[PDB]
Amino acid sequence: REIITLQLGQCGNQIGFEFWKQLCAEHGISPEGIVEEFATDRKDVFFYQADDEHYIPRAVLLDLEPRVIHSILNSPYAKLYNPENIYLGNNWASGFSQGEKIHEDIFDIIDREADGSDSLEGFVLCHSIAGGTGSGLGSYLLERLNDRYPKKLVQTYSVFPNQDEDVVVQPYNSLLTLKRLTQNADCVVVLDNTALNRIATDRLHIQNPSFSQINQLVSTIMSASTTTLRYPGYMNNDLIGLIASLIPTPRLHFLMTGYTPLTTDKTTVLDVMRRLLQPKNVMVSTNHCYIAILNIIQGEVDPTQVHKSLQRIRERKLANFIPWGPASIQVALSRKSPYLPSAHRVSGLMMANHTSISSLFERTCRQYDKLRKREAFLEQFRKEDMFKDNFDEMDTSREIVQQLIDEYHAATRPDYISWG
Amino acid sequence: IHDWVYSGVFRDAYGEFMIQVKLYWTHGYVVFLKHIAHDIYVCGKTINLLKLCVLMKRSITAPLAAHISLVNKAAVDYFFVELHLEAHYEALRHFLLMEDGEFAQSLSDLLFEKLPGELLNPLVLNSVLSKALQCSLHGDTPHASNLSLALKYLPEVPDVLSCLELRYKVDWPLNIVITEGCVSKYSGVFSFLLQLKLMMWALKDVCFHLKRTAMAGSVQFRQLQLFKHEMQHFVKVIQGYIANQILHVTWCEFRARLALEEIQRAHAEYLHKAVFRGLLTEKAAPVMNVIHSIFSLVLKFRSQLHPNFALMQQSYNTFKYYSHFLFKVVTKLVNRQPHLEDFLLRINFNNY
């Protein structure tokens, strides 16, 4: 059903605008919203059911001090959506306080779009971890949505920040935002800028327009994640049916992503299964076994050979898995999307709950603990000091992520029949 | 022979023609080669229907069978280019087999509010279909007409039971191809699919009861969710087995085999393969016998809804016992299939 998309921060507004351009080019949509002469499919997931099928995206843009929003403005895709839901520092404290002072009218924008919608099923946050203006503001405002609407689902698209540390409060910003992602969000998809830049230098020799290329990558990711909804498929036409298979524990909602064609410039399903089982098709960088793996595929397949593919991949025993419990690898299939150029016809995408991300969390834990012991990298924000005199919110987040690391490592153990 | 095939009027003088002649059919089948006799018997009834719209046979059968092929190809083409036979299957699949996104989860959810003194009269069953059909936007075919929500038993009643009839009605020149016994067999598998939707609704109900209390993220809370994820894995992986056998590997054939009696036997072989790989046959009956115990336990797990925390833990343990019990008896019956090889993957990865 009806899901309202949230874009915020410089990075989040970038991939949100790119993804809306992707869905405008993808379906039979003009740059004005007009249904084209080649448009059928399910068109009410983010698309406003207008009379002449002006499929207006449910896209709420809220930031302050607009820079990239001006670049969004001089475009014909500012005529695709505008139900007047577009709204005009880089620290957690500054963004937090700026979100605090104007929370009411932007939440009125939220409420107007909410009652204007037929239903509400999820909040999709276009974001990046410590995204400058996105950080602080997004954690605050995410707390406002989670308090204000406890009956909805939260998926947060963000990337792991790698800017080669310059802001020195970035582990604090990511730590507090990660606390809010634990307690005010039900799904967080994070990706490594390092591994994506490695794949970009792998397939081609371009790494310099990294923003533009990464918009293509995560726009392919998000269109592939919603393709079963936006084109008539069979299952995971709800977000919640997709989320339920991944999560055995509502604090372990952090998923690894991989994509089977690394070049775009076909063959059977067993082959792409073996490809995706390799960790070099993964977009993300002791012993770690997955909790549950699920794959979406789109392309030209043999409908009987997918049975044979699962049969051979099983009897190969090409993976490990976790001691505690019967899960599986899970196959999901949908159509190859029409009305775009179709190169490398099989494109697969994987969502897996892996314990390897606890090491990445521990890296940020060690960075935060190091800068905390040194205590010269908070820069004494007055907004942070009046917000928290003792800075024990960071201590509480470090406690939360440590409890999650403990849950990760006891889930690696067969004693997750007992407590983790 | 030269009358009934060409002019299209059946001919018999003294009753020495073997063939002799309600709905339309009154013909009765009860030297020459018998390989052409049944061909004459069917090549006449076709032409009769187009009007309403050394001793060897080498000098006889060659100018005779050359027209039988023409009559047969006109007959088979009459189905496709006029009745749109190829569209009917990929349309009935949408609704009857519930191959429709946001239709099954919109119809079943409304049905289970009653299951009861509702869903008796025809103004609530007559309105409940049109609310599910609008939520999907797959219709506006003439197969969204002839949809008929009905029943064979009214709702007056551990208890996982639900049943419903849903039919697509058919007129006469299609009744001989897609019969009213075949639509009933779609209803026969449809009952099982709807019964599964009841479980996907009950576990969703206890999942929504826990959804609203999140405030609470305590030890007793997460340990409860650990129960749910386990049962839901089983339910979705067995639904994936159904969505494999009855919906992928059988769905490849009979749109590649489709590219007068033979069309009927092709449909009847198609569905016979669909019921066989789907394990509802008597050969794979004990595999099906265990599933209702698991269903009963999932409904029990919803019923407790804490001072019954140990009770819910006990029901989860009974689910684990029967789930590991199923894998032994299906391993035991590998020696009694290629599709049953797929079943072991769904039930076991390292469940042993």
Between CA A333 and CA A298 the distance in angstroms is: 6
Contact A355, A409 (CB under 8 A): yes
DSSP structural state of residue A29: B
3-state secondary structure at position B111:
helix
- Give the Cβ contact number of residue B94 at 10 Å: 20
Q: At what angle do helices B125-133 and B104-114 cross, to 10 degrees?
A: 150
From first CA to last CA, the distance across chain A in angstroms is 35
Please tell me the distance in Å from A47's CA to the nearest CA on chain B: 14
H or E stretch at B190: helix B182-211
Beta B147-150 vs B165-168: how paired, if at all? antiparallel
Taking the C-alpha atoms of residue B247 and residue B250, their distance in angstroms, rounded to an integer, is 6
Tokens of B200: 């996907």
Q: Other C-beta atoms within 10 Å of B89: how many?
A: 17
Resolution (A): 8.7
Method used to obtain the model: cryo-EM
The SS3 call for residue A5 is: strand
DSSP state of A224: H
Amino acid at A392: D
Contact A244 B229 (CB under 8 A): yes
List, as residue ranges, the binding site of A: 130-136
**Residues contacting A50, CB < 8 A, separation 6+:** A33, A56
Partner-chain contact A326 B233, CB within 8 Å: yes
Give the DSSP H/E element, type plus range, for residue A27.
none
Interchain proximity A326–B349, CB inside 8 Å = yes
Q: Are the Cβ atoms of A311 and B105 closer than 8 angstroms?
A: no
Of the candidates A106, A91, A95, A87, which has an alpha carbon nearest to the alpha carbon of residue A148?
A106
DSSP H helices in A277-417: 305-316, 357-374, 382-387, 392-412
Residues A263 and B204: their CA atoms lie apart, in Å, by: 41
Task: Supply the DSSP symbol for B247.
Answer: I
Contacts of A200 (CB under 8 A, 6+ apart): A206, A207, A210, A213
Task: Say how far apart CA B243 and CA A331 lie, in whole Å.
Answer: 11
Is the torsion defined by CA of A125, A130, A133, A138 positive or negative? positive
Q: Is B2 exposed, middle or buried (0-12, 13-18, 19+ CB in 10 A)?
A: exposed
Contact B350 A326 (CB under 8 A): yes
User: How do beta strands A47-48 and A56-57 pair?
Assistant: antiparallel
Length, in residues, of chain A: 420
Residues of B with CB under 8 A from a CB of A: 99-102, 105, 136-138, 207, 211-212, 214-215, 217, 219, 222-223, 225-226, 229-230, 232-234, 236-237, 240, 243-244, 247-249, 251-252, 323, 339, 341-342, 345-346, 348-351
Residue A35 carries which DSSP code? B
- In which order are the strands placed within the sheet that holds A59-62? A86-87, A59-62, A4-7, A122-126, A153-157, A187-189, A254-259, A347-354, A290-298, A329-334
The letter for the amino acid at A103 is H
Task: Indicate the residue type of B290.
Answer: V
Instruction: Please tell me the distance from the alpha carbon of residue A241 to that of residue A99, in angstroms, as a whole number.
Output: 33
The Cα–Cα gap between B312 and B227 comes to 9
Query: What angle do helix axes A170-183 and A92-101 make, rounded to 10 degrees?
Result: 50
Alpha carbon distance A66, A17 (integer Å) = 15
How far apart are the C-alpha atoms of A350 and A256, rounded to whole Å?
Answer: 8
Rounded distance between C-alpha atoms, residue B6 and residue B50, angstroms: 11
DSSP state for residue A122 in the 8-state scheme: E
Residue with tokens 């029967």: B322
Contact A416, A402 (CB under 8 A): no
Q: Measured between alpha carbons, how far is residue A91 from residues A63, A173, A378, A383, A389 in Å?
A: 14, 7, 10, 10, 17
Report the gap between the CA of B223 and the closest CA in chain A (Å): 8
Tell me whether A147 touches chain B (CB under 8 Å).
no
**Strand partners of residue A60:** A6
CA atoms within 13 A on the CB side of A163: 15
A-to-B residue pairs, Cβ atoms closer than 8 angstroms? 98
Specify the amino acid at residue A218.
V
Contacts of B56 (CB under 8 A, 6+ apart): none
**Rounded distance between C-alpha atoms, residue B123 and residue B286, angstroms:** 40
Tokens in use for A121? 């099923």
Q: Three-class SS of residue B276?
A: helix
- Out of A238, A311, A326, closest to residue B351 by CB: A326
The identity of residue B199, as a single letter, is: M
Q: How far is the C-alpha of B76 from the C-alpha of B263, rounded, in Å?
A: 8
Partners of residue A237 in chain B, C-beta under 8 Å: 101-102, 105
DSSP secondary structure string, B308-325?
A: THHHHHHHHHHHHHHHHH
Tell me, what amino acid is at B59? S
CB half-sphere exposure, A28, CA atoms < 13 A: 13
Per CB-CB distance under 8 Å, the chain B contacts of A150 are 212, 214-215
Of A352, A348, A353, the residue nearest A309 (C-alpha): A348
| CA gap A363, A369 in Å, rounded | 10
Q: 315-374 in A: which are within 8 Å (CB) of B?
A: 321, 325-328, 330-331
The amino acid that residue A228 corresponds to is T
Query: How many DSSP H helices and E strands does chain B contain?
Result: 14, 2
* Angle made by CA atoms A55, A57, A58, in degrees to the nearest 5: 130
Tokens linked to A159:
């990337």
CA geometry: angle B254, B259, B264, nearest 5 deg: 50
Half-sphere exposure of A124 (CA within 13 A, CB side): 20
Is-contact A296 A224, C-beta < 8 A? yes
**C-alpha atoms less than 13 angstroms from C-alpha of B258 in its C-beta half-sphere:** 21
B151 dihedral zone (left: phi>0; alpha: psi -120 to 50; beta): beta
For tokens 């992520």, name the residue: A401
CA atoms within 13 A on the CB side of A210: 15
Give the Cα separation of B165 and B187 in Å (integer): 6
- Between CA A72 and CA B299 the distance in angstroms is 52
Residue B160 CA to residue A381 CA, distance in Å, equals 60
Task: Assess contact for A283 and A240: CB atoms under 8 A.
Answer: no
- What distance in Å separates the CA atoms of residue A110 and residue B298, rounded to the nearest whole number? 38
Detail the DSSP E strand segments found in A120-265.
122-126, 153-157, 187-189, 254-259
The CB density around residue A299, as the number of other CB atoms within 10 Å, is: 21
**Encoded tokens for A76:** 């014909």
From B323, which residue of chain A is nearest by alpha-carbon distance?
A326
CB B347 within 8 A of CB B330: yes
Under DSSP, the state recorded for B284 is G
Q: Are A309 and A268 in contact (CB under 8 A)?
A: yes
Closest CA to A330 of B21, B232, B318: B232
Per-residue b or e along A379-394, where b marks 16 or more CB atoms closer than 10 Å to that residue's CB: eebebbeebeeeeebb
Taking a C-beta distance cutoff of 8 angstroms, is the pair A144, A103 a contact? yes
Distances (CA, A) of B158 to A269, B282, B298: 41, 25, 9
DSSP state string for B270-304: HHHHHHHHTT-SGGGHHHHHTHHHHHHHHHHHHH-
User: For residue A399, what are the CA distances in angstroms to A122, A147, A254, A271, B316?
Assistant: 28, 22, 17, 43, 31
Q: Give residues preceding each break in chain B, C–N over 2.5 A.
A: 21, 30, 53, 115, 157, 214, 259, 305, 336
How many CB atoms are closer than 10 A to CB B173? 14
A328-363 residues labelled b (16+ CB within 10 A) or e (exposed): bbbbbbbebbeeeeeeeebbbbbbbbbbbbbeebee
Calculated CA dihedral for residues B146, B150, B152, B154, nearest 10 degrees: 180
A210 touches A197 (CB < 8 A):
yes
Cα torsion at A208, A212, A218, A219 (round to 10°)?
-160
Across the interface, do A245 and B102 touch by the CB < 8 Å criterion? no
